[PDB]
Amino acid sequence: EICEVSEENYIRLKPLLNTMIQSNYNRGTSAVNVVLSLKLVGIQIQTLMQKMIQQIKYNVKSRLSDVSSGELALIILALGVCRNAEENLIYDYHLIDKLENKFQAEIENMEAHNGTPLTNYYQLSLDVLALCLFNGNYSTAEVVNHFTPENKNYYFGSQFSVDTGAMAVLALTCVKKSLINGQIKADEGSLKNISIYTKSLVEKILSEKKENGLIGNTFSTGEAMQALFVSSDYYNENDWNCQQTLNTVLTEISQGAFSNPNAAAQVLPALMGKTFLDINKDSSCVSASGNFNIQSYISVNYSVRINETYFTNVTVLNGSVFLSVMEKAQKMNDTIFGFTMEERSWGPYITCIQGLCANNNDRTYWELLSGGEPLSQGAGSYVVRNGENLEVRWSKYL
Ligand SMILES: *[C@@H]1O[C@H](CO)[C@@H](O)[C@H](O)[C@H]1NC(C)=O
Ligand SMILES: *[C@@H]1O[C@H](CO)[C@@H](O)[C@H](O)[C@H]1NC(C)=O
Ligand SMILES: *[C@@H]1O[C@H](CO)[C@@H](O)[C@H](O)[C@H]1NC(C)=O
Ligand SMILES: *[C@@H]1O[C@H](CO)[C@@H](O)[C@H](O)[C@H]1NC(C)=O
Ligand SMILES: *[C@@H]1O[C@H](CO)[C@@H](O)[C@H](O)[C@H]1NC(C)=O
Ligand SMILES: *[C@@H]1O[C@H](CO)[C@@H](O)[C@H](O)[C@H]1NC(C)=O
Ligand SMILES: *[C@@H]1O[C@H](CO)[C@@H](O)[C@H](O)[C@H]1NC(C)=O
Ligand SMILES: [C-]#N
Ligand SMILES: [C-]#N
């Protein structure tokens, strides 16, 4: 099933539009995914598009190897949504060949280690999808090997990463199309195995559908919708009411739930009935499209768990975010609450506390909780309230 925002309700998407526009004044965040979504729905913003190229050119010279596989995949997608002059940058800077190397690097690490890539299956899926859409050299055999639905990298503890599964589905579907078309060769029987993978992932995705229509959570719904658009083969119209989902999302938007330019960007395409598979490197650009009118305090229970728990009383200004709490709590005692952050596009990401750094290969990270409950937002975004047990917990995957 595919449902779209009624053109009568197109105005409801205004906050996302604005939110993504304000991204301009932020060299910290990425403009790639922002421009990616916009271009994908036939909307062009010069100011953001200019910012995108700036970052892209800045990263081809230096950082070239520091850019992650998925990040490169995203760059490739944003430049090649439709055919324009900027698409040449894909074939000028050998980005596809670069992605093949970065993707292979992910593979190497999975063998050099217990099955963990340099990043994650979400990015891995992005890689395969990009390589697939742009005729890159990838092993369809290696795809079947590493993408089985029961793979550990689809799950975080007990939670099945809806985001990951959704992106996996999109990628796998692309290969599925690239196989039916003579666009690439594959060991016969692979199509079946891929379809089966896809079938399984969809059922898992739908299993995480909330009663209000959300799939996973708010910020996984956007791309879960895309995955479900392209996989009607594996579900009935009673297993999902798309219009309900669309309604719930529209409600949250009005509630400012997508103040995060990355959260906004990732939800935009599905709301307009678009998916990443709508990307055609051989032109579809609708250029003419686009036309736009224009002293309270609070206290919380700040826990930090490793084996033992170090908890304190923190009092901050109203409207303060989780990260601010962490910063004030680190002033109270640096030995116990001193931490390390990285900007990580999405916003501040907590890497180390007390010198204990998260390790990808060790499957370990710091989890953010509110009264023993995993947050749906990053530390910089999550506005804290009152009486909350704000726990930061050393965690693994099962
Ligand atoms: C498909 O899956 C079956 C069972 O897992 C396996 O025996 C076979 O090798 C796979 N076929 C291909 C072409 O990968
Ligand atoms: C555009 O928005 C402004 C906001 O002040 C409003 O005054 C005006 O009526 C709108 N015009 C059109 C054509 O939408
Ligand atoms: C604060 O958090 C810690 C860890 O969960 C807990 O031991 C303590 O009881 C909490 N205090 C309150 C006010 O609930
Ligand atoms: C906590 O305790 C475990 C086992 O008692 C120990 O191996 C580890 O170093 C400590 N911290 C963690 C969770 O790594
Ligand atoms: C922490 O102290 C603040 C004021 O310093 C107080 O409002 C709060 O009640 C204290 N914590 C608890 C357990 O109430
Ligand atoms: C601070 O403001 C928020 C919303 O503006 C409100 O929910 C909260 O009640 C205020 N502070 C307290 C302690 O109530
Ligand atoms: C930090 O907290 C610990 C634990 O109570 C305390 O012993 C120490 O004096 C505090 N000061 C620092 C910065 O180490
Ligand atoms: C993140 N899960
Ligand atoms: C998750 N970052």
Tell me the CATH number at 398. 2.170.130.30
| CATH code where residue 78 lies | 1.50.10.20
Ligand 4 atom showing the smallest separation from residue 394 Cα: 13
CA of 264 to the centre of ligand 2 (A): 24
194 and 308 housed in the same domain: no
119 and 131 housed in the same domain: yes
Q: What element of type H or E holds 40?
A: helix 32-40
CB atoms within 10 A of CB 49: 18
CA of 355 to the centre of ligand 6 (A): 35
Q: Which residues line ligand 6 (CB under 6 A)?
A: 296, 298, 318, 386
Number of H helices, E strands in the chain: 15, 9
Structure tokens of 53?
A: 């190229």
Phi first, then psi, for residue 29 (nearest 5°) are: -80, 165
Q: Which domain holds residue 364?
A: 295-398
Q: Which of 275, 294, 313 is the last residue of a domain?
A: 294
- Ligand 1, atom 1: nearest CA belongs to which residue? 193
113 CB-contact burial (10 Å; exposed 0-12 / middle 13-18 / buried 19+): middle
105 and 234 housed in the same domain: yes
Residue 357 lies in a domain: yes
Identify whether the C-beta of residue 322 lies closer than 8 Å to the C-beta of residue 375. Answer: yes
3-state secondary structure of 196: helix
Whose atoms come closest to the Cα of 313: which ligand? 5
110 and 135 housed in the same domain: yes
Strand pairing partners for 156? 159
Residue 275 lies in a domain: yes
Could you give the CA distance from residue 327 to residue 349 in angstroms, rounded to a whole number? Answer: 13
Residue 2 lies in a domain: no
Ligand 6 atom showing the smallest separation from residue 318 Cα: 1
Residue 118 lies in a domain: yes
Identify whether the C-beta of residue 241 lies closer than 8 Å to the C-beta of residue 213. Answer: yes
Place of tokens 């299956």: 121
Phi first, then psi, for residue 297 (nearest 5°) are: -135, 160
Q: Which of 261, 294, 327 is the last residue of a domain?
A: 294
Residue 36 lies in a domain: yes
Q: Is 367 annotated as a binding residue?
A: yes
Residue 3 lies in a domain: no
Identify whether the C-beta of residue 3 lies closer than 8 Å to the C-beta of residue 246. Answer: yes
